Design a protein around this nucleic acid. Structure first.
Ligand SMILES: Nc1ncnc2c1ncn2[C@@H]1O[C@H](COP(=O)(O)OP(=O)(O)O)[C@@H](O)[C@H]1O
Ligand code: ALF
Ligand SMILES: [Mg+2]
Length: 422
DNA sequence: TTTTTT
């Protein structure tokens, strides 16, 4: 069962009427495991969300965007074009009106506009414009030393800097109206059988330069990616694409190319997957959409066992079952354009963003062009249970590590067990 | 740079 610190956080959150809680702690402390106990306690009263397909599946929930039907773009502060309440007799309206608890996992990855849009979407649907989250009890779980929210450099960064001052969930204006009670987990459950590896991760989290050189001497193994049962992580999509292409090319099976059908407007680069996707029998893949029948999920890893122009059979890693995947129609709505493609991507290599929240048997980090996101390295290192399960393509220099002053201000302030934005 | 999608 639950550890004594998970049990203490479980009781602190469930026994009080206080409507805003944050359960935070280092990687693998058992936050999502506590989230499963919270789901058994609240059952139907709670909706569980997470910012990524991976984190949502790990949390036995849904992405924030698929639940609220938010567009995959910047969500302007309380903007009616971006934040639309559901229809008068829709299944989403009923779900929002009846909800008592919102469980939000991997909150560190939740961008400020996404959290603010959740607040406003709840207040509008529930017709409670003066109550944060429309009276919904909010249980946030995550870690600000793991991946920072994704901020494209142009007009999105400007808008965020002008509206919130920064992109972090804790910079949301909702926190001026409600105090966030903070509960902590400290004990590594993922690395519990390797205590020196748990301590090395702790020193790396604290930016210790000696722990980095120790990590480099022990874990640098350029051939680490070629070993069976290893998942490769890369900072970039184009880096993962090159490593996936090489594995696909080595497979003996006849290739089959899947040309996406693009109709109407539908802008390039967005595009939820590649327009000309090549697959073979034996290819390692990741599923990009939840089955409307509930047999597979966005984030499911698997292997292609059969393939044809309009269908493929995928053996799932999660349950050892075969599922039949047909092309999916992504519709750009203002229904200006469509993008029809099989909702699959190659997955011998994935971005570090797609691994956050997972416990992996074996990981190899391919540095490529380098680290660009705060918490990116830390996420890659902390996916495994033991040091021997981790390998790096090259040594990492101390100059590659990132500092986020806004994260440090938040982390210092929550030491008091509360977050109250001025 | 990366995420969300429809
Ligand atoms: N109380 C516990 N007892 C045993 N194993 C646990 C416990 N809590 C977590 N774990 C395991 O440790 C790993 C990391 O837990 P997880 O909840 O995913 O951590 P986090 O969400 O904090 O990163 C998982 O393999 C999980 O099953
Ligand atoms: F904090 Al985690 F997997 F959710 F390390
Ligand atoms: Mg987790």
């Amino acid at each position: 069962g639950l550890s004594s610190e998970q049990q203490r956080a479980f009781l602190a959150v469930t026994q009080t009427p206080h409507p805003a809680h944050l359960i935070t702690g280092p990687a693998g402390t058992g936050k999502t495991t506590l989230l499963y106990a919270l789901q058994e306690f609240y059952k139907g009263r709670a909706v569980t969300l997470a910012p990524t397909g991976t984190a949502a599946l790990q949390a036995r929930g849904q992405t924030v965007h698929s639940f609220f039907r938010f567009p995959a773009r910047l969500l302007r502060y309380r903007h009616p074009e971006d934040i639309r309440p559901p229809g008068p007799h829709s299944p989403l309206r009923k779900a929002i009106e009846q909800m008592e608890v919102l469980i939000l996992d991997e909150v560190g990855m939740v961008r400020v506009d996404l959290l603010e849009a959740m607040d406003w979407a709840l207040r509008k649907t529930r017709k409670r414009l003066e109550e944060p989250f429309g009276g919904v009890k909010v249980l946030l779980l995550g870690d600000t030393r793991q991946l920072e929210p994704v901020v494209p450099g142009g007009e999105e960064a400007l808008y965020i800097a002008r509206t919130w001052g920064g992109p972090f969930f804790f910079q949301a204006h909702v926190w001026e109206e409600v105090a966030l009670r903070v509960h902590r987990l400290w004990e590594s459950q993922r690395q519990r059988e390797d205590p020196l590896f748990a301590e090395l991760l702790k020193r790396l989290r604290q930016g210790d330069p000696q722990a980095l050189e120790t990590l480099n001497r022990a874990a640098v193994r350029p051939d680490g990616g070629e070993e069976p049962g290893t998942l490769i992580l890369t900072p970039r999509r184009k880096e993962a694409d090159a490593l996936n292409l090489k594995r696909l090319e080595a497979l003996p099976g006849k290739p089959l190319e899947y040309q996406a059908q693009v109709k109407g407007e539908f802008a390039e680069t967005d595009f939820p997957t590649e327009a000309a996707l090549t697959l073979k029998k034996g290819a390692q893949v990741i599923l990009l959409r939840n089955d409307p029948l509930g047999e597979y999920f966005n984030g499911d890893l698997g292997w292609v066992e059969d393939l044809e122009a309009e269908a493929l059979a995928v053996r799932l890693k999660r349950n050892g079952r075969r599922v039949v995947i047909r092309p999916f129609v992504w519709e750009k709505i203002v229904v200006v354009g469509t993008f029809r493609q099989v909702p699959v991507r190659l997955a011998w290599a994935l971005t570090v963003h797609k691994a956050q929240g997972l416990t992996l048997d074996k990981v190899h980090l391919e540095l490529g062009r380098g680290l660009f996101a705060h918490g990116q390295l830390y996420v890659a290192l902390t996916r495994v249970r033991r040091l021997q399960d981790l390998s790096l393509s090259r040594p990492i220099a101390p100059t590659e590590l990132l500092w986020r002053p806004e994260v440090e201000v938040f982390e210092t302030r929550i030491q008091e067990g509360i977050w109250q934005k001025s």
